[PDB]
Design a protein around this ligand. Structure first.
Ligand SMILES: *[C@@]1(O[C@H]2[C@H](O)[C@@H](O)[C@H](O)O[C@@H]2CO)O[C@H](CO[C@H]2OC[C@@H](O)[C@H](O)[C@H]2O)[C@@H](O[C@@H]2O[C@H](CO[C@H]3OC[C@@H](O)[C@H](O)[C@H]3O)[C@@H](O[C@@H]3O[C@H](CO[C@H]4OC[C@@H](O)[C@H](O)[C@H]4O)[C@@H](O)[C@H](O)[C@H]3O)[C@H](O)[C@H]2O)[C@H](O)[C@H]1O
Ligand SMILES: [Ca+2]
Length: 166
């Protein structure tokens, strides 16, 4: 059982994402208002997909006030208080030098854990951490943050988010 839905983008038709809010089931891709140069989100069919046939590509053309202004959040993430989950995802970038934070938190924005400010290379890597649901929440979120200025001009690819009981 996986806590998150559509973790590998296989539920979504290929193409540029034109409905950030609802166009990728299991995810919210809304952009913060402080961003003035829009990013591009695209579900890509590709033979190097770590799983299945699709990945999500995020082209960062500019940043805003906080790195969370360019983001992909998995939701809902269905969990149980007390349980420790393993988070795993695959990521790479068009150019070495990209930076991503992989986070999990509640609908209050309190975080349970993160992998902070990770360097992303041109080759796929698994990024993994454990976290415990430490409050009473059963429906949480998994925000991925791309809006670091180091990413401007780059494209970050993600696939295979799986949040699983340890
Ligand atoms: C967390 O602290 C980090 C710290 O930032 C690091 O520097 C450090 O080393 O580690 C700690 C954790 O151990 O920071 C989170 C934000 O991180 C991102 O921005 C800051 C940057 O330094 C960092 O690199 C980057 O990853 C923060 O979560 C954010 O919380 C925002 C709300 O903040 C309040 O409530 C939670 C409290 O903890 C804070 O003190 C309060 O100010 C929240 O902002 C809201 O975002 C809305 C949009 O949301 C959607 O898009 C962004 C997605 O992240 C989100 O899932 C989507 O739903 C917007 O509409 C609101 O107006 C805005 O307030 C951010 O979404 C959330 O990511 C952690 O709380 C904090 O512990
Ligand atoms: Ca996939």
């Amino acid at each position: 059982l996986v806590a998150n839905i559509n973790g590998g983008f296989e539920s979504t038709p290929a193409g540029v994402v034109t409905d950030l809010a609802e166009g990728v089931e299991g995810w919210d891709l809304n952009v913060g208002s402080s961003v003035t140069n829009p990013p591009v989100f695209e579900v890509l069919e590709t033979s190097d997909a770590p799983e299945g046939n699709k990945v999500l590509a995020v082209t960062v053309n500019g940043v805003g006030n906080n790195p969370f202004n360019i983001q992909a959040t998995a939701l809902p993430v269905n969990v149980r208080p007390g349980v420790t989950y393993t988070y795993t995802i695959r990521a790479r970038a068009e150019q070495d030098g990209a930076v991503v934070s992989f986070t999990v938190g509640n609908q209050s924005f309190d975080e349970y854990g993160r992998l902070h400010h990770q360097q992303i290379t041109t080759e796929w890597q698994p990024f993994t951490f454990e976290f415990t649901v430490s409050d009473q929440e059963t429906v949480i979120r998994a925000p991925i943050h791309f809006g670091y200025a180091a990413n401007v001009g780059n494209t970050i690819y993600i696939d295979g988010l799986a949040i699983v009981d340890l």
